[PDB]
């Protein structure tokens, strides 16, 4: 069954990532005794890879090498590195090993779409109707991988990495049975600057756009903070005997999953929310939701009420994370010359998830380290300065959109 092939590819593509993505901070901190700086600069590598590797590898997919074979090469490298990473004991090595893995992994995020699109389109189907049910298994792979590694007792354990590599290899084997995905050669007459998304640098001529993009970087910096240290913040409550055995202490990935759960459901309510309140309002709902998220983490407790607040934060996360990115790219498209409109979202997403990522990763790790003393982190204060930077972002955005 073709559909089933694509669904296994989606599942695996994301299972291998979820097995370690959210927990790796904790494993660096609780087990490897890493400070916040080293962790934040290890998760920064995602951004370094993301800013330019997707572009170039999609380029080669389009001109010299089947997307199938390029995807294969990537996850192979992903697998080898994930294995080595479970044998890495120092931060510089963790950063270098993760950086390679991301340089290989980041491009696959579009390569699987290239592949799934052609697979359905060369088979009398339209993506708008038959892709969403194939893209829900990538979300299942992710949330279940979180569930599994949590429940197997491998959260704080280097095992998560062995499992991710194991999925990556299983993956590579599965993508060998793929059918020949031709070199699309759609980009051919495309100017050399057009392919890398270099037009949109000129687009900084528009003062309003320039303002928007740097805002998008500043806002994007806090996008993954919860995903980088939320599991470490929930494991922080080891230090009390009362919370030691608490389920949300024991299995943080299980509580954090509600974050991904709510992101999926809220991505579903994005179109309607746009129709009812507009681009700028939906982006504002995102910026305000980040405040609430970090505020609820700041008073979160394994206690009954503290857990209530913690779960509330999870729910708020989904709107917070989905809304800004969807309404942002819609805003950019609506606001720019149609000819260059796509380079707009190229540069928007690059600024927001690459540069936003590098800057956020590094700075937040440093905030943690600055408020980590004797090996114990004052999470309440950490989350307050993050909720307060959310507030500054709210204020400045209110200025721009009144």
Same domain, 37 and 109: yes
Give strand pairing partners of 373: 376
CA distances from 195 to 159, 205, 333 (A): 39, 20, 18
All residues at 6 or more sequence positions from 359 whose CB lies less than 8 Å from its CB, including other chains? 47, 217, 221
Token couple for 342: 């796509």
Token couple for 196: 């890398």
Same domain, 281 and 216: yes
Phi-psi region of 85 (alpha: psi -120 to 50; beta: other; left: phi over 0): alpha
Place of tokens 């979300």: 139
Same domain, 13 and 159: yes
Length of the chain in terms of residues written: 402
Same domain, 59 and 41: yes
Nearest to 222 by CA among 358, 92, 109: 358
Nearest to 50 by CA among 320, 352, 264, 345: 352
d(CA 277, CA 177): 46
Stated in angstroms to one decimal place, the resolution of this structure is 3.0
Its domain, for residue 144, covers 2-195
Same domain, 27 and 85: yes
Question: Which DSSP symbol is given to 186?
Answer: -
Beta strands in 250-400 (DSSP E): 372-373, 376-377
Nearest to 372 by CA among 94, 24, 90, 37: 37
- Among 195, 213, 233, the domain-final residue is 195
Task: Please name the method used to determine this structure.
Answer: X-ray
Token couple for 189: 């007459």
d(CA 235, CA 247): 11
d(CA 201, CA 374): 45
Same domain, 150 and 111: yes
All residues at 6 or more sequence positions from 225 whose CB lies less than 8 Å from its CB, including other chains? 360, 364, 386
Dihedral pair phi/psi, residue 369, rounded to 5°:
-55, -45
Same domain, 256 and 150: no
d(CA 43, CA 358): 8
**Contact by Cβ (8 Å): 71, 111:** yes
* End-to-end alpha carbon distance in the chain: 53
Tally of domains within the chain: 2
């Amino acid at each position: 069954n073709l559909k089933l092939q694509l669904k296994i590819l989606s599942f695996l593509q994301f299972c291998l990532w979820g097995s370690w993505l959210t927990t790796l901070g904790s494993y660096m901190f609780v087990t490897l005794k890493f400070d916040g700086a080293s962790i934040g600069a290890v998760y920064s590598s995602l951004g370094i890879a993301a800013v330019f590797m997707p572009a170039l590898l999609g380029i080669v997919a389009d001109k010299w090498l089947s997307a199938k074979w390029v995807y294969a090469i990537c996850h192979t490298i992903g697998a080898i590195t994930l294995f080595m990473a479970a044998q890495v004991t120092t931060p510089e090595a963790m950063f270098l090993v993760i950086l390679i893995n991301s340089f290989a992994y980041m491009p696959t995020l579009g390569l699987i779409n290239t592949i799934s699109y052609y697979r359905l389109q060369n088979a009398g189907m339209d993506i708008v109707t038959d892709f969403p049910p194939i893209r829900i298994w990538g979300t299942i792979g992710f949330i279940m991988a979180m569930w599994v590694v949590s429940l197997s007792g491998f959260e704080l354990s280097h095992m998560q990495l062995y499992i991710g590599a194991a999925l990556s290899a299983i993956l590579v084997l599965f993508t060998l049975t793929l059918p020949h995905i031709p070199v699309a050669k759609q980009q051919a007459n495309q100017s050399w600057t057009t392919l890398l998304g270099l037009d949109a640098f000129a687009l900084f001529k528009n003062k309003r756009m320039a303002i928007f993009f740097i805002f998008s970087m500043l806002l994007g910096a806090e996008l993954q903070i919860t995903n980088m240290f939320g599991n470490t913040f929930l494991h922080s409550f080891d230090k009390d005997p009362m919370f030691a055995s608490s389920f949300i202490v024991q299995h943080a990935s299980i509580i954090m999953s509600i974050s991904q759960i709510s992101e999926t459901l809220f991505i579903l309510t994005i179109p309607f929310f746009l129709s009812r309140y507009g681009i700028k309002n939906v982006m504002m709902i995102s910026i305000v939701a980040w405040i609430l998220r970090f505020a609820l983490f700041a008073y979160g407790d394994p206690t009954p009420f503290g857990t209530v607040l913690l779960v509330l934060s999870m729910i708020v996360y989904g709107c917070a994370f989905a809304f800004f990115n969807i309404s942002g790219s819609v805003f950019v498209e609506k606001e720019v010359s149609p000819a260059i409109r796509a380079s707009a979202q190229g540069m928007f997403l690059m600024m927001t998830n690459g540069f936003g990522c590098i800057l956020g990763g590094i700075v937040s790790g440093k905030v943690v380290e600055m408020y980590t003393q004797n090996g114990i982190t004052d999470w309440q204060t950490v989350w307050l300065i993050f909720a307060g930077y959310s507030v500054v972002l709210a204020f400045a955005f209110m200025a721009m959109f009144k």
